[PDB]
Symmetry: D2
Subunit: 310 residues, 4 copies
């Protein structure tokens, strides 16, 4: 049996202490692997901070470096699991399976989804075929790449999707079907190393819409953000106001990253406009990447290249 | 043949002034109806402003009250057309068709989509079956409701979609197939009358995400916003910093609307959280409804109901 | 509280007879209404037959004509529920809610979806706002119209979808949100009355695909089918072999309905091809409408209109 | 510049002789590569036969074996392009790009899509990064794997999709963005060799629905089909009739493959039922694979393994 450690970052996703009420809630899990529960942190994912995500990443790198650990499963709130997951997707230097699992319904609710999600997560974490596939998010019978997956619906069980990238694999009838391998850098082939890191750069996200305010750029600049991700209109389009706001930020050495608020797609290069473009990274993902990029360089050209390859 | 007035708000979406380059680029349109072209404004949809959308709404109410006008087609940029169309969805007091048409590829590009989207738009605007359906957005053989449709992809022609609500109808083989009638208030049954208004209450949208800063709330507040739409994590989840920013906003007379960044779904009521909830209006749609709501009242009970019924 | 009759057609979708295991498995249901359980039939939906669906339709018309019955919930297998539900969509002459509920995971499975789907189904059936919406299929927090909904995936819980038409509504946080009203004929406004019928005209579905054989047409014909629904390539495209098979069918009194295997969309009229076109009814829905149509007439002009209006 | 040969299998997809009217319709193509037009065959894809697909596969293998050919582009009707493409996906022993391209609108129609599709196809065919990605189908800015892509809508421009597998890459702003590499065997790592093959086994497809006829199995058996692909209900579910029909076929040495009519998903193994299961192959794909499998063996276990790895 695989040795899999399950790290909890909040309350239980299955069962009625903490990561243990969970490990007991689903017995069948002990047939897939010899599990070990660890309550790494404990809060609503909307309260998950880069500092904790950074600790989580270091903890997991540490665990995976040992031979008595075959893979890691992380229970996490669904709201920002995509942010936390993409962070480790870029900072865990191991081919060992790293699976984030979440639930849309409380563990006490009727037809709660946590129990089946955990089981699937553990199955995927211990399966030999799961190696070297980057960080994954398992829920609702699907396996999504941390780089593509995102919560697309506020409240439905099937919320996680990668509309244009699809899923890596699915788990049907207790069998894992692997469909794709993502064509991007990650985990073992990533330049973002978190060994010795203590904090991350400040990157805020500004929305683009009709009449968007130029003053929020100022506020961001005045609070010393090292980077600004712009959840732009359409393909990162910027209004005159947003442009004056970006030009201003670019003078102060702030890195401007143009993404989209649409939800999917490529924000293509465009020299007529300020900042860099996010490729197919959505705002939440673009922010995690922009931060890690800055722990390496401030060179606009190198960062752009990261965004086209990570 | 129907009398359709084509209103342009930017450059031409068909052909190589402006609204006439457009009307002559697709002669086939003169077969579906008698068209008159009016260049209402001229700028990229990312620079379209509430003040102008306001004038558009009045210009459209004015045209539709005329016996020699059976419907209106409005060419608009794809980036914010959902904002503008929804604005008119709530303010045009007529059952005559109001069809916004856009184009994802430049008029002079290879396989430009504008010619066809315009033809379908005119056909929809002139069809007698199109009456009383609310404002529509026509593009890529589909007819979406202004209340549900949104640009889901940055650069694809099939970008417009209402994942959970579908399309009101479609146009295949030069024929309109009507599938749905939205079960919401709009146009002739809407209480929002902006006849005479010059400016609308200021509403900003703040993003929800790990480490989101309280200071962005302080900034919007200090600049006099009257309402803040929150593109929250998951179902309008708020961090301790966003909650503090929301309470500060409430203590300063700013109305708070909790939406979601996910892109789809329902943000449910939560007695344990501050502010109102957006039902299924995404951030961009929510901002439009809240602005209009604030010209009428600041009563949270009343505004909440608007968001459950419009 | 509403009076809801739960009709079972197979085993229980909730709990560990049959319809009572079900009603006692989800006590919360007794809170939404007063339920009476009736085991109508008992077999897997892949073995559900037109003759039984016919009896179900009459049993449902019978119950709904009673003042002590406010609505009906019908448990059914997921495999052919779209066929059965659409049958009742066209034959139940009542505005009272008729909600089919299914479950993708066995009742005793980990994270079984039946308990919740049943609760939502009962809530939808009993809500006063649910009247006059046509037959509904409730599962996975969604309410799809019997006319558009279809099982799009073999094994996932989110299998039910109407890609182009969306859901009539959804159930989030124990609340129903109604998004659409289908713009089609059904129930109280349907001409299809099957009161008293025992058997329906025989209709087969033949697939369209490279090298498809003419002999399958000969076979259906020789066995006395009255109608052939063609799950064609693309927009009901036919090969020279399928055309020959269709002409043979026409020369033998079999009505030909051209649909599509793609899974979505409109099959448009084509004067240059044989047979009728299915509008946007998929093969399985088309078969149901054609059978019912044939109990009324064989007039192609009339049947074509049914397919554009039901 | 890459040397790319464009093989036409029908009329032109762009422009107003044959593959030449097409090569002239889009000049920009000559900037991406030194192209050579060849009219391989000439008919409506719904009339495409395995014999021709087999010739096409041999022709392309022959072309790719030369150094003066860098990649191949095949214009094809949209109705069965997925069948033809999957065939070469399994029989072209080269890492050289093989791109199938199609158009949904006639080349003379307004906003015809062929011109942009061709250009994108050629770009993808000549780009060095496109090597070893299996056969691809380019249309509507998307790059889909022949193994996953399918026509999901009868008439819309965005019809091609792999709902659960997503696209391999997309082409936005004249730049190719590669997202996934499929995790299946194909082209250079495929055991299906067509060198010397003259014909393919007979495989027909039978639909599964309420009241499905057992006689079509007999008809298929009596016409000597070597294989039967079953577009089953839900997850390849079989009614009593279909089971008697399969048992009958299994006695006569016919290979029974259970797929689904739903459109997506896994048909899982199930020993309680007859035949083999198609994994995530849809009927059209399962038929192409079943035929090629039979040109190698009739062993039920080896064929099943093919279906879980190809």
């Amino acid at each position: 049996l695989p040795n899999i450690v399950i790290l909890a970052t909040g309350g239980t996703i299955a069962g009625s202490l903490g990561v243990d009420t969970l490990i007991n809630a689903v017995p069948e899990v002990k047939k897939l692997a010899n599990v070990k529960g660890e309550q790494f942190s404990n809060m609503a994912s909307e309260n998950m901070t880069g500092d904790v995500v950074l600790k989580l990443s270091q903890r997991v790198n540490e665990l995976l470096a040992r031979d008595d650990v075959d893979g890691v499963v992380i229970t996490h709130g669904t709201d920002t699991v995509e942010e936390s997951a993409y962070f480790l997707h870029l900072t865990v230097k191991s081919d060992k399976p790293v699976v984030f699992v979440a639930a849309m319904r409380p563990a006490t609710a009727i037809s709660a989804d946590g129990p089946m999600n955990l089981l699937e997560a553990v199955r995927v974490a211990g399966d030999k075929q799961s190696r070297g596939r980057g960080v994954m998010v398992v829920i609702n019978d699907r396996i999504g790449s941390a780089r593509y997956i995102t919560k697309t619906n506020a409240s439905t069980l099937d919320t996680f999707r990668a509309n244009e990238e699809g899923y890596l694999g699915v788990i049907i009838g207790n069998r894992i079907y692997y469909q794709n391998r993502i064509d991007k850098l990650h985990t073992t082939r990533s330049v973002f190393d978190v060994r010795g890191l203590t904090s991350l750069p400040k990157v805020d996200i500004l929305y683009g819409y009709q009449d968007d305010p130029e003053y929020l750029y100022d506020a961001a600049i005045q609070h010393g953000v090292k980077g600004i991700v712009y959840a732009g209109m359409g393909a990162g389009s910027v209004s005159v106001r947003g442009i004056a706001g970006m030009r201003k930020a670019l003078e102060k050495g702030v890195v401007v990253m143009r993404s989209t608020r649409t939800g999917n797609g490529i924000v293509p290069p465009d020299e007529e406009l300020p900042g860099l473009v996010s490729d197919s990274l959505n705002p939440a993902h673009a922010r995690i990447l922009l931060m890690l990029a800055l722990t390496r360089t401030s060179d606009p050209k190198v960062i752009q290249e990261y965004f086209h390859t990570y």
